[PDB]
Amino acid sequence: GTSNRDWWPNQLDLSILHRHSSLSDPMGKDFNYAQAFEKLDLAAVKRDLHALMTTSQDWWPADFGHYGGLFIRMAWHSAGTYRTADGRGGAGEGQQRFAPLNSWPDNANLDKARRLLWPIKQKYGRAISWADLLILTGNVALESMGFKTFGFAGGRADTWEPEDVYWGSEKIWLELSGGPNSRYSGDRQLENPLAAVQMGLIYVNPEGPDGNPDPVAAARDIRDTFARMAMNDEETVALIAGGHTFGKTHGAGPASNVGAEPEAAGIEAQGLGWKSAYRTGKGADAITSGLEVTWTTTPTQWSHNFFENLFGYEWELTKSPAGAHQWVAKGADAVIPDAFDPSKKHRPTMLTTDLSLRFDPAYEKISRRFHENPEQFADAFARAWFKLTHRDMGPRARYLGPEVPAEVLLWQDPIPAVDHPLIDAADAAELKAKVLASGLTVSQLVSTAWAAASTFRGSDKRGGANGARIRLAPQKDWEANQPEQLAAVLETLEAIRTAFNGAQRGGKQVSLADLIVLAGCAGVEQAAKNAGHAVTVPFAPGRADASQEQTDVESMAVLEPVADGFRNYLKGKYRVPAEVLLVDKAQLLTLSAPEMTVLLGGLRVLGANVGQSRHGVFTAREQALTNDFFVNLLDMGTEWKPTAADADVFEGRDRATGELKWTGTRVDLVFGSHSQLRALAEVYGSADAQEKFVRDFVAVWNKVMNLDRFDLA
Amino acid sequence: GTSNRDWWPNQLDLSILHRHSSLSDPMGKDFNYAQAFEKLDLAAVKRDLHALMTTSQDWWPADFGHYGGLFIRMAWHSAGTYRTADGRGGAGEGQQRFAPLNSWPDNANLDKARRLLWPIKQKYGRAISWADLLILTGNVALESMGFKTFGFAGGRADTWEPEDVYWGSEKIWLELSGGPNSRYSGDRQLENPLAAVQMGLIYVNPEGPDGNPDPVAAARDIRDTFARMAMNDEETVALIAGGHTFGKTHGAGPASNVGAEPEAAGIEAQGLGWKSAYRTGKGADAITSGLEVTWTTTPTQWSHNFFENLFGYEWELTKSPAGAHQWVAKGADAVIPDAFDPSKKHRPTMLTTDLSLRFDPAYEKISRRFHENPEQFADAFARAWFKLTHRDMGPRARYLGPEVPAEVLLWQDPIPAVDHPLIDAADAAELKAKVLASGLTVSQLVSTAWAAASTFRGSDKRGGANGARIRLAPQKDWEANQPEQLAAVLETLEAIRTAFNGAQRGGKQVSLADLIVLAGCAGVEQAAKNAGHAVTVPFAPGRADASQEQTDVESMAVLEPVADGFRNYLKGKYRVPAEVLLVDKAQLLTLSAPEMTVLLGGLRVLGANVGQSRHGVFTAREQALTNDFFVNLLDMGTEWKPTAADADVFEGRDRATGELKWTGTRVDLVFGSHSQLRALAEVYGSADAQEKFVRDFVAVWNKVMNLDRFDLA
Ligand code: HEM
Ligand code: HEM
Ligand code: NA
Ligand code: NA
Ligand SMILES: [O]
Ligand SMILES: [O]
């Protein structure tokens, strides 16, 4: 059947904003996963998982009688899709069970791992999500084999359809770099937001870059991809050596024996894939990656044998039975156990990417230190495993259960506890009036609050106005935040705050994070008043102010907006049209198309544009909250044309006189062009819509202000 | 960006079930269009529409100073996508304003018509939908030009995204038949459910079949397509001749002058398309279809000139200025007015498809009768225009406003008014006990009520249990309804009914339509009791029984299910896989994926399969309402394979012994295979889910029983 996407493959796709509807969710609209999880007997689930580890099923027999290595890989892949550039991917939504991830070649045979967990899932039901269970099972695997984990938090709610993620443009699984849709350009520069070297890989190619088995070159790819998954050199070494202390790879015969991935398999496979014609097709004959490596002499026990082997031998390039490049220890004895036959032993083996840990000079130093001090290795691996598996969970307030680590980690963007009484509704009114009396304008107040709250992204639940990090490096200096303007507003607000807090009794005080939000609320109320409408904008206190010392400046860099349609802002010239980037930002903010539309139209007439640009400011009463953007956009008395100087900027002229009325960007005009957006704009531009426009704007403003408020969840 | 659809183009698309979510809708979830419409000043809207007729805008000047013809085509095209096969298309959701229909070639320049209506739409706001306004505008155009319409009902709610409709598989706009994705095969057989001869056309090619200008062959295409839009020969002749009494076609220069359709145009076009480089690009120079024909000597007034010209001249094949085939009156004088220049006149002209009305022998007789008896022509056209434009609105109960015709028409599948007291809750309890005491089984009761209620489709709101048409021709003889078994059940129910009604006072009685549904409710209650659960199933009385003479048997044929996954039924072997047909059926029933899942799993264990097939009956306690379907489907102790005798039937065998445990179809197993459906099945197959399964089943059962109950809306 030919679809709109086929006919108009470059029109904008709004369906990404309408996922996660209550229609697709089988739980009641009242279901609260956190409440279900808080009643789970987590100890009982772990005891069941522990027993599973050594209870082999004949449809996928356990290597060495222990599934631990398989489940560690499963949990690591569940997490290992994460990209810091947009916060997409990660373990937090259990997306490994859906397309495309369930059928990525790097996820081959993890369908079996997930199926092994069905009986436990079935037992505990809605009290443990698949997303939590995946991670939990990796923890229990590690515990069962003698490794002390750093802790575990539940609270990843299950999702019910695939997330819309850009995974790259290649039309061929695992395509080598340099094709017509190459994700690389220049000197092996990986395109943002990607974090893997080939379509369908988690990070890197275990044979080496584009298959070339050079551990030094491979180390470059490791370092770049891991950095794009928020991991530094020490964390990267600890993760790879830690993981590869367990289990084995599977490459017992030629890859041409392996059939269709799960999404392409026949219905009778019941969601499983990669059925293999090679001998029994499983167990001793398994083929997964094609490589056939077992790293340590005790694959079912934590040890420091990975580094003893890496540094204790020299390595020879060889081929697996499927033809994949891999390395064997020169002159070694057969000291590694076989996974099924107690009478057979094998020489130590390694992947090209394992050897990177020795042959890259900066990794070598860390690997040596971990080899000489295995307790340092164990602690680094525990911390990194925690980080990896929790990186997209959001604020610590979302962490559930009895195993949450008490240590506050800098990577969590921590928010201090509030230890004083909060402002009440009368105090909020007094502060709104003091803010308005200071002479801060609607434009300044709205722009400042927008800048602080709009860093939130629902992908990894980082950002938001909680913390007041807008006053800190690096947010205070982002160009989108207008650093000089911002500084003058913050200075005025900080004086109001000091005066209010100094006049209190009882220990009551207001955070600057709260005041910034409240002040933006006053700005929206005043704008409504300027239009003749009396509204109260909701406000919930309880944010706290984080310090510079509790803020990782480098980690914060990925939250910088380089494109923010809501402020008509674009930091440079990009390959992706600006309207596409608007919808991308709307999705990260968790907005629907109607919400996006209302919010944009309002922000335009409130003076939220960076630099005071007049683009899209289609009103003669700026700083009044009206539906003028829509009424003027939709007026067929104006004709629009792109400018000579800039094809991305348009002039609206009176059709009859030729007089210049307005200018706008693609971001503005899309609302008059795209057939679904223009239908939304028509609702808000109708004669009966001014009260609705104000109400719906106040509601979406409040939603944005509260995106990070999981303390009130 | 490579997507799941790109990698796995034949996996099933469930997003079709999650359209129309409140996410995409800018109105509140409380908005009720009927209530808004009931307050509209319809008379005021019409007076604005009358004024618009002759208010020419320079950007698309009105032919003859009057936009009536353009708006008549606009309304006709809005209605003219309707297919009786699935009830999809039609004017009832205003989908002409969205992709792909807004950009179909046959809708060229109707973007101008719709934009001329924006100021009216803006003025009245939510109180008149675009869907209603399109049709109203065509009515006002006809009235303005002298033709009295039969009536008008409001109540078409606007929609906010494109409908998922199969419009054919061709990848080229307007591709001629016989290509790699031909919609024709055999002796000019058009594939179901399609109702147009080429991709992007409303019905037929105005030059003739595949462009060949043979009016007799064209007539065959006219008759087949119009039949597939619910129109017989008399209605077809009346519509074509009635429509082409007005206005003109547009073909002033070569088609190569015409630019991108709206969905491909630049953002500056602000939703419009087909910008033309030919001279002024508009008015006297307009190019729409490429034909250049004006049918009557008074194109802005109702007349009897269409048939005077059709019969009064002989016709010669010629070409338009764009090179399109059309016909000119041999030896005629220049009697037709020009649209713009009072000093020019033209010879009468006709399309190939116009001449079909004379050269097809059956149309000739109708056309002659209409020529000789123009009052008959007028009344037929008024009735047919009403039908065309309201065909998809559903029962009469949905018709709003002061212009609804009082005459009840056969095509509306009318339901008699209820004129007696309805049964109350005590009476319902008494009838359910009598039903259960009769000896009717859970299987019979459930299967019968399912058969009655599940004929509903939300596409055109035909079907459902209202009317008791299951006891009439042709429903009582459909294979899917198990005619013999059905007859036995109905005989028992009719006896119950007779006895209950004979015992009443005060004129109370129960319809058989109600009793069918109520008896199905009793069967569901009984099934829950068989499983140990105490469940009351909601029931709403008020259905009435329609007569045979109120049931057009040929019109009812298109509701016959040839595939109904919910009864594991397929009438033959089809090119579309059965699981695709299930989701299609779920969409017509208005079900979400979780609803579809729960419903199907319950029906299987209640004995709703046609022929008492064991396919998918994964329980040892049939006729008990349990979640056994899910628990057994998801059991990894069973391995499934297709049978030797039939690749569409699967055997599930114990993995350890090889013993046969179950059989299933593709419809059954998809719930175990599709990664989103299996995630749903997992929720209902969990240990905590038995009570939820029962409750969610009763809710969806009730939903289906009430799909046609617009009397209670
Ligand atoms: C450069 C990064 C990495 C590369 C290229 C890589 C590559 C691979 C490959 C190719 C396999 C074999 C799959 C098969 O045939 O079954 C595998 C296995 C494994 N990986 Fe990694 N890996 C990397 C990092 C990680 C990390 C960070 C972890 C966990 C912390 C991990 C844990 C494991 C485990 C436990 C297995 C064994 C699975 C089994 O016993 O079934 N790896 N790895
Ligand atoms: C065999 C069926 C039909 C064919 C092939 C057909 C074809 C066409 C074409 C090709 C045009 C010219 C488009 C343009 O260049 O502007 C047109 C115009 C029109 N048709 Fe039809 N038509 C059909 C049936 C109908 C019916 C059922 C109605 C209404 C009841 C209708 C009413 C109109 C009117 C009013 C116009 C004039 C538009 C104007 O003045 O701008 N037609 N038709
Ligand atoms: Na994420
Ligand atoms: Na329809
Ligand atoms: O891995
Ligand atoms: O038409």
In SS3 terms, A594-653 reads as: HHHHHHHHHHHHHCCCHHHCCCCCCCCCCCCCCCHHHHHHCCCCEEEEECCCCCCEEEEE
Q: Is the CB of B295 under 6 A from ligand 6?
A: no
- Asked if the Cβ–Cβ distance from B688 to A262 is below 8 Å, we say no
Q: How far is A676 from chain B (nearest CA, A)?
A: 6
Q: How far is B522 from chain A (nearest CA, A)?
A: 26
Query: A662, A588, A678, A674: which is closest to A630 by C-alpha?
Result: A678
Residue in the block written with tokens 């029994």: A280
Distance, in Å, from the CA atom of A302 to the CA atom of A146, rounded to the nearest integer, reads 5
Q: How far is A685 from chain B (nearest CA, A)?
A: 7
Q: Rg (Cα) of chain B, in Å, rounded?
A: 28
Output the CA torsion sign for B205, B206, B209, B211: negative
* Residues whose CB falls within 8 Å of the CB of residue B217, separated by 6 or more in sequence, listed in order: B208, B209
Q: In whole angstroms, what separates CA B645 from the centre of its chain?
A: 37
Which residues on chain B are in Cβ contact (under 8 Å) with A682? 118, 121-122
Query: B639, B633, B585, B647: which is closest to B605 by C-alpha?
Result: B633
Distance, in Å, from the CA atom of B642 to the CA atom of A265, rounded to the nearest integer, reads 13
Percentages (nearest 5) of helix, strand, coil residues in chain A:
45, 5, 45
Distance, in Å, from the CA atom of B266 to the CA atom of B270, rounded to the nearest integer, reads 8
* Residues whose CB falls within 8 Å of the CB of residue A167, separated by 6 or more in sequence, listed in order: A100, A194, A199, B1, B2
Distance, in Å, from the CA atom of A623 to the CA atom of A603, rounded to the nearest integer, reads 9
**Selected residue of A23, A56, A163 to mutate for chain B interface (largest B Cβ count, 10 A):** A23
Partner residues linked to A639 by β-bridges: A653
What one-letter code names the amino acid at A10? N
Q: Is the CB of A265 under 6 A from ligand 1?
A: no
Q: DSSP letters along B460-509, please?
A: TTB-SSTB-GGGSTTGGG-GGG-HHHHHHHHHHHHHHHHHHHHT-STT--
Cis ω on the peptide bond leading into residue B100 (within 30° of 0)?
Answer: yes
Distances (CA, A) of A390 to A89, B594, B644: 12, 30, 49
Q: In whole angstroms, what separates CA B240 from the centre of its chain?
A: 21
Nearest to B166 among A1, A100, A673 (CB): A1
Q: Is the CB of B388 under 6 A from ligand 2?
A: no
Helix, coil or strand: residue A317: strand
Among the listed residues B66, B77, B533, B615, the single catalytic one is: B77
Residue B186 backbone zone (phi > 0: left; psi -120 to 50: alpha; other: beta): left
**In B187-290, which ranges are continuous DSSP H helix?**
215-227, 233-243
* Residues whose CB falls within 8 Å of the CB of residue B507, separated by 6 or more in sequence, listed in order: B420, B421
Residues in chain B: 713
CATH number for the domain whose boundaries are B1-167+373-407: 1.10.520.10
Contact B94, B330 (CB under 8 A): no
- Asked if the Cβ–Cβ distance from B169 to A689 is below 8 Å, we say no
CB atoms within 10 A of CB A446: 26
As assigned by CATH, the class of the B168-372 domain is: mainly alpha
- Locate B248 and state its tokens: 């003109």
Distance A155 CA to ligand 3 centre (A): 14
Query: A191, A254, A188, A260: which is closest to A221 by C-alpha?
Result: A188
Please check whether the two domains, B1-167+373-407 and B565-688, share a CATH topology.
no
CB atoms within 10 A of CB B399: 19
Contact A245, A303 (CB under 8 A): yes
Query: A489, A103, A93: which is closest to B6 by C-alpha?
Result: A103
Nearest to B7 among A115, A263, A689 (CB): A263
Contact B306, B295 (CB under 8 A): yes
Distance B490 CA to ligand 5 centre (A): 63
- Locate B386 and state its tokens: 């009403």
Partner residues linked to A570 by β-bridges: A563
Distance, in Å, from the CA atom of A397 to the CA atom of A383, rounded to the nearest integer, reads 19
DSSP B90: S
Q: How far is A191 from chain B (nearest CA, A)?
A: 13
CB atoms within 10 A of CB B712: 9
Helix, coil or strand: residue A453: helix
Nearest to B162 among A4, A102, A592 (CB): A4
Residues in chain A: 713
- Calculate helix-pair angle for B666-673, B675-684, nearest 10 degrees: 90
Cis ω on the peptide bond leading into residue A577 (within 30° of 0)?
Answer: no
Partner residues linked to B85 by β-bridges: none
- Locate A146 and state its tokens: 């003698």
Cis ω on the peptide bond leading into residue A193 (within 30° of 0)?
Answer: yes
CATH classification of A565-688 is 1.10.1670.10, yes or no? no
- Locate B278 and state its tokens: 């030919």
Give the CATH number of domain A408-564+689-713; options: 1.10.520.10, 1.10.510.10, 3.50.50.60, 1.10.10.10.
1.10.520.10
Which residues on chain B are in Cβ contact (under 8 Å) with A644? none
Consult the annotation and say whether A390 binds a ligand: no
Backbone angles phi, psi at A258, to 5 degrees: -95, 130
Distance, in Å, from the CA atom of B348 to the CA atom of A136, rounded to the nearest integer, reads 81
Query: Resolution in angstroms, to 1 decimal, for this deposition?
Result: 1.9
Residue B54 backbone zone (phi > 0: left; psi -120 to 50: alpha; other: beta): alpha
- Asked if the Cβ–Cβ distance from B126 to A650 is below 8 Å, we say no
Q: Is the CB of A37 under 6 A from ligand 5?
A: no
Backbone angles phi, psi at A318, to 5 degrees: -145, 180
Contact A363, A219 (CB under 8 A): yes
Helix, coil or strand: residue A345: strand
For atom 1 of ligand 5, the residue with the nearest CA is: A73
Q: DSSP letters along A202-250, please?
A: SS--TTSGGG---HHHHHHHHHHHHHTTT--HHHHHHHHHHHTTS-B--
Query: B568, B644, B560, B663: which is closest to B611 by C-alpha?
Result: B568
Contact A315, A326 (CB under 8 A): no
- Asked if the Cβ–Cβ distance from A676 to B98 is below 8 Å, we say yes
Output the CA torsion sign for B37, B43, B46, B48: negative
Distance, in Å, from the CA atom of A327 to the CA atom of A244, rounded to the nearest integer, reads 14
Distance, in Å, from the CA atom of A235 to the CA atom of A204, rounded to the nearest integer, reads 16
Cis ω on the peptide bond leading into residue B213 (within 30° of 0)?
Answer: no
Distance, in Å, from the CA atom of B510 to the CA atom of A62, rounded to the nearest integer, reads 64
- Locate A531 and state its tokens: 């239009």
Which residues on chain B are in Cβ contact (under 8 Å) with A661? none
- Asked if the Cβ–Cβ distance from B687 to A25 is below 8 Å, we say no
Query: A190, A191, A152, A713: which is closest to A461 by C-alpha?
Result: A713
Q: Rg (Cα) of chain A, in Å, rounded?
A: 28
Nearest to A26 among B26, B631, B683 (CB): B683
Which residues on chain B are in Cβ contact (under 8 Å) with A15? 15, 161
Contact A588, A86 (CB under 8 A): yes
Strand order in the sheet with B315-319: B315-319, B325-329, B349-350
Distance, in Å, from the CA atom of A85 to the CA atom of A297, rounded to the nearest integer, reads 39
For atom 1 of ligand 6, the residue with the nearest CA is: B73
Query: B26, B534, B655, B356: which is closest to A699 by C-alpha?
Result: B26
Distance B392 CA to ligand 4 centre (A): 5
The experimental technique used to determine this model is X-ray
Distance A98 CA to ligand 3 centre (A): 14
Which residues on chain A are in Cβ contact (under 8 Å) with B7? 99-100, 103, 263
DSSP A287: B
Distance A350 CA to ligand 1 centre (A): 11
DSSP A315: E
* Residues whose CB falls within 8 Å of the CB of residue B301, separated by 6 or more in sequence, listed in order: B145, B146
Pairing of strands B184-185, A660-665: unpaired
Query: A590, A612, A605, A585: which is closest to A693 by C-alpha?
Result: A605
Q: In whole angstroms, what separates CA A278 from the centre of its chain?
A: 38
Query: A227, A240, A162, A161: which is closest to A196 by C-alpha?
Result: A227
Residue A611 backbone zone (phi > 0: left; psi -120 to 50: alpha; other: beta): left
- Locate B412 and state its tokens: 């509306």
- Asked if the Cβ–Cβ distance from B636 to A682 is below 8 Å, we say no
- Locate A341 and state its tokens: 């036959």
Distance, in Å, from the CA atom of B441 to the CA atom of B444, rounded to the nearest integer, reads 5
Distance B123 CA to ligand 4 centre (A): 27
Residue in the block written with tokens 């070569």: B254
Query: B543, B559, B541: which is closest to B551 by C-alpha?
Result: B559
Domain limits of chain B?
A: 1-167+373-407, 168-372, 408-564+689-713, 565-688
Contact A152, A135 (CB under 8 A): yes
Q: Is the CB of B291 under 6 A from ligand 2?
A: yes
The 3 state secondary structure assigned to B533-595 is: CCCCCCCCCCCCECCHHHCCHHHHHHHCCCEEHHHCEECCCCCCCHHHHHHHHHHHCCCCHHH
- Asked if the Cβ–Cβ distance from B673 to A271 is below 8 Å, we say yes
Output the CA torsion sign for B702, B708, B711, B713: positive
Contact B89, B82 (CB under 8 A): yes
- Asked if the Cβ–Cβ distance from B688 to A170 is below 8 Å, we say no
DSSP A289: S
The most distant pair of C-alpha atoms in chain A lies apart, rounded to whole Å, by: 94
Query: A217, A219, A179: which is closest to A199 by C-alpha?
Result: A179
- Calculate helix-pair angle for B233-243, B361-372, nearest 10 degrees: 60
**Selected residue of B98, B117, B270 to mutate for chain A interface (largest A Cβ count, 10 A):** B270
Cis ω on the peptide bond leading into residue A483 (within 30° of 0)?
Answer: no
What one-letter code names the amino acid at B246? F
Which residues on chain B are in Cβ contact (under 8 Å) with A124? 686-688
Q: How far is A11 from chain B (nearest CA, A)?
A: 7
Query: Is residue A430 exposed (0-12), middle (13-18) or buried (19+ Cβ within 10 Å)?
Result: middle
Q: Is the CB of B339 under 6 A from ligand 2?
A: no
Mark A396-416 as b/e (b = at least 16 C-beta within 10 Å): bebbbbebebeeeeebbbbbe
Residue in the block written with tokens 């070297």: A197
Distance, in Å, from the CA atom of B403 to the CA atom of B135, rounded to the nearest integer, reads 13
- Asked if the Cβ–Cβ distance from B169 to A2 is below 8 Å, we say yes
Closest atom of ligand 1 to A70 CA is: 41
Nearest to B268 among A121, A650, A655 (CB): A650
Contact A571, A479 (CB under 8 A): yes
> Catalytic site residue B77?
yes
Distance, in Å, from the CA atom of A165 to the CA atom of A179, rounded to the nearest integer, reads 21
Please give the angle made by the CA atoms of B310, B312 and B315, to the nearest 5 degrees.
60
* For chain A, counts of helices (H) and of strands (E): 24, 12
Helix, coil or strand: residue B35: helix
Distance, in Å, from the CA atom of A681 to the CA atom of A689, rounded to the nearest integer, reads 11
Q: What does the CA dihedral B492, B494, B498, B504 come to, rounded to 10 degrees? A: 100
Which residues on chain A are in Cβ contact (under 8 Å) with B180? none
Backbone angles phi, psi at A547, to 5 degrees: -90, 165
What one-letter code names the amino acid at B598? V
CB atoms within 10 A of CB B644: 7
Query: Is residue B71 exposed (0-12), middle (13-18) or buried (19+ Cβ within 10 Å)?
Result: buried
Q: Which residue of A has its CA nearest to B271?
A: A673
Residue in the block written with tokens 């921590």: A414
**Selected residue of B23, B25, B703 to mutate for chain A interface (largest A Cβ count, 10 A):** B23
Cis ω on the peptide bond leading into residue A474 (within 30° of 0)?
Answer: yes
Stretch (H or E) spanning B185: strand B184-185
Distances (CA, A) of B596 to A546, B170, B178, B700: 49, 30, 37, 8
- Asked if the Cβ–Cβ distance from A689 to B15 is below 8 Å, we say no
Residue in the block written with tokens 């009368």: A426
**In B233-323, which ranges are continuous DSSP H helix?**
233-243, 305-312
**In B211-313, which ranges are continuous DSSP H helix?**
215-227, 233-243, 305-312
Helix, coil or strand: residue A569: strand
* Residues whose CB falls within 8 Å of the CB of residue A289, separated by 6 or more in sequence, listed in order: A106, A108, A206, A249, A250, A251, A324
Contact B543, B517 (CB under 8 A): yes
A-B C-beta contacts closer than 8 Å:
246
Distance B247 CA to ligand 6 centre (A): 10
Query: B616, B614, B657, B615: which is closest to B638 by C-alpha?
Result: B657
